[PDB]
Amino acid sequence: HDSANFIKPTSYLAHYLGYAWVGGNHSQYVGEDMDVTRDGDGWVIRGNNDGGCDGYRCGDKTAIKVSNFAYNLDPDSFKHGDVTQSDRQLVKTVVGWAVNDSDTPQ
Amino acid sequence: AEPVYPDQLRLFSLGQGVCGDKYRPVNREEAQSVKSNIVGMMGQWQISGLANGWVIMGPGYNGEIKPGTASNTWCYPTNPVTGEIPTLSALDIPDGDEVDVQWRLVHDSANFIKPTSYLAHYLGYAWVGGNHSQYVGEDMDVTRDGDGWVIRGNNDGGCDGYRCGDKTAIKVSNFAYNLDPDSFKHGDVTQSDRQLVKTVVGWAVNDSDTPQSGYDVTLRYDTATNWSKTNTYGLSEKVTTKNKFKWPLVGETALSIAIAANQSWASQNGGSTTTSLSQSVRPTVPARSKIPVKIELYKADISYPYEFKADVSYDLTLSGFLRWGGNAWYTHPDNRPNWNHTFVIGPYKDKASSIRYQWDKRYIPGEVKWWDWNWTIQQNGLSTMQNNLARVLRPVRAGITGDFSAESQFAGNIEIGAPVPL
Amino acid sequence: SGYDVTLRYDTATNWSKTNTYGLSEKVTTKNKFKWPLVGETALSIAIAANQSWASQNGGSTTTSLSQSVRPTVPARSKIPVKIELYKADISYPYEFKADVSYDLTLSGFLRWGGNAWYTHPDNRPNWNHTFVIGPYKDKASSIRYQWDKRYIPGEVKWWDWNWTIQQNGLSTMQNNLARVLRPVRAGITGDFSAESQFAGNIEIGAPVPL
């Protein structure tokens, strides 16, 4: 949702490479009047299509998709809390004895 | 851009641009982030103002955002408050075994029965209460069935209402215990029904002039199972012909010729499981002496008692039909349909059963896939919902005593004997 | 110290079972061909299709016995070693002191006037039930568990102890059950015996200078 740091540079990148209609109907500049929507595991940014427009195929607007987020940790910053268990089902168990009858530790 | 919670939006009418005392106007980006919520709070042909000369239109205009000017202004607090669910102090239950503690939890009226009934009522379930009262959560019956408990309104006599008699039920099951690490103790382990598997005896002889440690005897025992399934398909073709041969000096010879071709396809799946038990002994023998050893393996039943101190968590299931006037499901049905949903009252397991996750996601319309909490806030008020949910999610602590038991487990014995001079 | 000799011995058994089902279809036709310079040629054509399903289950068991020797040898010398494995019958006596527990089974028919089963039958039916007089194993055979659960009607699934209290009095039942569940102690002597077990022998000998 950051306009000056994410939405404008990405729209200009798409415009410089030759994609068509990067922008909404309520503005004339690249990267303005854009809509952000959440869908599944990603996000979609597209120009708003409400009203009418002038141009050969205006209405087929370019979409930008963001997904596949990854995280590169600082090694000395990770912490975790308490581990809890639920729905426990036994598999197997064993008991025994170890007997030492000699004169030294074994 | 900052997140916008729909319950904090306010509409001033102090001229074009003027916006509250500790309030700032909402930008086009933020307004679009929650467009459906804002449009749902406007008149059919209403037009209201935003920041930097934009405007939003009502449901009659399909909620369009376009440049313009208006006298109204939607506004948001300069320093907004956090609408988080509070945390209360823990509820202590007197000691006992598991069923004893569960009995004391579900029969508590002020701490369990009322908050859960109010939660079911706020979400839109019908007829939460008994026939001998008019208030929510009173005249309820508690019954034990299997591994859980059921709480339902009493149905004795008559009632007035369209479908009174179809009363909502609340189910409690799947209890779990989070132990304090330094509180667990167990008692004596006892065995019964012992059947021998195998045994071995031996000697370890040392005839050199130094102590020796390089000896080993090992006994191992395994069992396994397996399964498989297969499917096959085939095709075939055959052609037959009769042929005669009037060869010289033979006169005539008759014979038939047949040629065939076939093709086949097969597919298989399977699996297996294995369990293994191993025991070893490795003695240290003094110079010029020898030592005897012995190993045994049995099968037996095992029992012992235990005790500890823990936190208690469980599952909660609500069953009934949803009210026609209004309910909190995100699709808002109006055909009075039957409904089931499970919440996990404890640590997080997944999004569909976590109240805290869904509550902290009411600012993202694309995340709202089970219950609509903005609707409950709109119907009842923010503090009411906060206090009810805080009472529902209150931690529980208890002391536990119990017994362990299992059939046909393993039991072993390993021995090193006294040395004998050579 | 880096030496090792190892001798290992294994035995195993296995089993399996299978079921199969199948279907088939065949179609046959006779066809004639009066080709030029052949006059007439006769032949039959057949086409078939089949389908099958199979299912299998099985298991196995294995037992293993292993022995090793790893000597430490002085500088400029050598040592001999030996390992043996036998099969034999084994016996020995023993003694100890212990607590004693057992099972108790009651067989008969239940009285028509009144009985303590939770369904309270009145057809004088034959009955069997087992109690475990000792540590806990499960709810159905534990007197103490059922006695401490007479305040939860949904737990009463075998015997009705409230009915016995009503018929006889609380202290009477308490004293009788206390005498039934009394602990027992004794000293024991016995003999162990088993056939075709394992017996081993491992030896490290005296060094020989080179």
What is the topological layout?
The structure is cut from a larger assembly and holds three copies of chain A.
Chain A: H1 3-17, E1 34-39, E2 42-47, E3 63-66, E4 94-95, E5 98-100
Antiparallel strand pairs in A: 1-2, 2-3
> Helices and strands of chain A: which structural class?
alpha+beta
**What is the gyration radius of chain A calculated from CA atoms?**
30 Å
- How much of the sequence lies in strands of chain A comes to 15-25%
Alpha-carbon distance between the two ends of chain A: 68 Å
Largest sheet of chain A: 3 strands, antiparallel
Most residues in contact, chain pair and counts: B-C, 58 and 60 residues
User: What's the multimeric state?
Assistant: part of a larger assembly
Q: What strand line-up does the widest sheet of chain A have?
A: 1-2-3
PDB class: toxin
Keywords: Pore forming toxin Styrene maleic acid lipid particle, toxin
Entry title: Aerolysin E254A/E258A in styrene-maleic acid lipid particles
Chains A, B, C: Aerolysin
What does this structure look like?
Chain C: It is found in: Secreted; Host cell membrane. Chain C: Belongs to the aerolysin family. This is part of a larger assembly, with three copies of chain A. Chain A has 106 residues and is of the alpha+beta class. Chain A is built from one helix and five strands, in the order αβββββ. Chain A has one helix at 3-17, and strands spanning 34-39, 42-47, 63-66, 94-95, 98-100. Chain A has a three-stranded antiparallel β-sheet with strand order 1-2-3, with helices on one face. In chain A, a hairpin with a 2-residue loop joins strand 1 (34-39) and strand 2 (42-47). Chain A is rod-shaped, with a radius of gyration of 30 Å. Chain A starts with a helix and ends in a 6-residue tail after the last strand. Chains B and C meet through strand 8, strand 12, strand 13 and strand 15 of B and strand 2 and strand 7 of C.
